[PDB]
Amino acid sequence: LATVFPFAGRVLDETPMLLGEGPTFDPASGTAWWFNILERELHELHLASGRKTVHALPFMGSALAKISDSKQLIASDDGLFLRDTATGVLTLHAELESDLPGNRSNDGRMHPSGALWIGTMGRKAETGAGSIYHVAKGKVTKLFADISIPNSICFSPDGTTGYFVDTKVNRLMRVPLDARTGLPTGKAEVFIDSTGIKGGMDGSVCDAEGHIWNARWGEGAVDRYDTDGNHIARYEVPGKQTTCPAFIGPDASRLLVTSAREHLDDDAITANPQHGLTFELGIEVKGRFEPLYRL
Ligand SMILES: [Cl-]
Numbered sequence: 001l002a003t004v005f006p007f008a009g010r011v012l013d014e015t016p017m018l019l020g021e022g023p024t025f026d027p028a029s030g031t032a033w034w035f036n037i038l039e040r041e042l043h044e045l046h047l048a049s050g051r052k053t054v055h056a057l058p059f060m061g062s063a064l065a066k067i068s069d070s071k072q073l074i075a076s077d078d079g080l081f082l083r084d085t086a087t088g089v090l091t092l093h094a095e096l097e098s099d100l101p102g103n104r105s106n107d108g109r110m111h112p113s114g115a116l117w118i119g120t121m122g123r124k125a126e127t128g129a130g131s132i133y134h135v136a137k138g139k140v141t142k143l144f145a146d147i148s149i150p151n152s153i154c155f156s157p158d159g160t161t162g163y164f165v166d167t168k169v170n171r172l173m174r175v176p177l178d179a180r181t182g183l184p185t186g187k188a189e190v191f192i193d194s195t196g197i198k199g200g201m202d203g204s205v206c207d208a209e210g211h212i213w214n215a216r217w218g219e220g221a222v223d224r225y226d227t228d229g230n231h232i233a234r235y236e237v238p239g240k241q242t243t244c245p246a247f248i249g250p251d252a253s254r255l256l257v258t259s260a261r262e263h264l265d266d267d268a269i270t271a272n273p274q275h276g277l278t279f280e281l282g283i284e285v286k287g288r289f290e291p292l293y294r295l
Pocket residue numbers: none
């Protein structure tokens with residue numbers, strides 16, 4: 001091998017996140033959204049102005065989908081909730097491991113059919129405690145079981161392949177899908193075996209050409225893979241506990257990257273105060289805006 005691109009981007013938000021995750025962009029308002037999972041915060045950044053707002057949640061949100069200009073869907077440890085964007089009022093939409101207090105939600109992403117894929121996990125990453133679910137029109141269907149840390153959920157440009165990983169295993173899987181529903185039409189196949197290679201495969205996006213861009217926890221990097229699964233580049237970022245990328249900007253042509261301070265000792269934070277910050281890379285990407293969730 002991958003070509004290394006040292007960081008030449010910028011800091012989008014100087015506030016450090018304990019566990020920055022789940023970033024997404026609303027092109028209609030020009031606003032990036034992400035979570036601070038463990039602190040129950042939903043962060044809002046208006047890009048053009050740099051105006052930052054932090055919204056307190058009664059649960060650990062980990063994924064956000066737009067429904068309309070007035071409504072969003074939030075996946076959390078306590079279920080799936082509708083959020084009114086004007087008032088911030090939250091209303092239960094569907095249960096999601098709502099009777100499993102030992103688990104929380106993690107990585108999730110919208111399929112172009114309007115269905116959400118969302119991962120869950122034991123709060124201590126208990127082996128095999130997690131799953132990946134499909135949510136469409138409030139109906140929840142389990143897709144994959146026995147996953148310790150679900151991650152890297154994303155989809156090919158035509159909606160016909162899904163990708164995911166168990167971060168504890170680091171074998172990125174591909175799944176053939178029905179593009180009209182986002183449901184699998186075949187079993188998962190190993191696409192990228194990165195087992196034993198340093199760092200954990202965390203959140204991913206898939207660009208307009210079908211390349212996967214994966215945040216690598218512990219390596220301060222976003223790794224890019226071509227459509228054969230070759231590792232062609234590594235884009236360095238200052239926060240080493242890299243968690244997730246997102247396409248941002250008016251042409252979905254910039255890349256936002258969240259990071260985390262979780263577990264890091266005080267000396268580590270002192271040595272690198274950029275742990276946990278939210279960045280933009282210096283390079284162009286050819287992205288796509290996230291699909292809307294269909295009620
Ligand atoms: Cl160009």
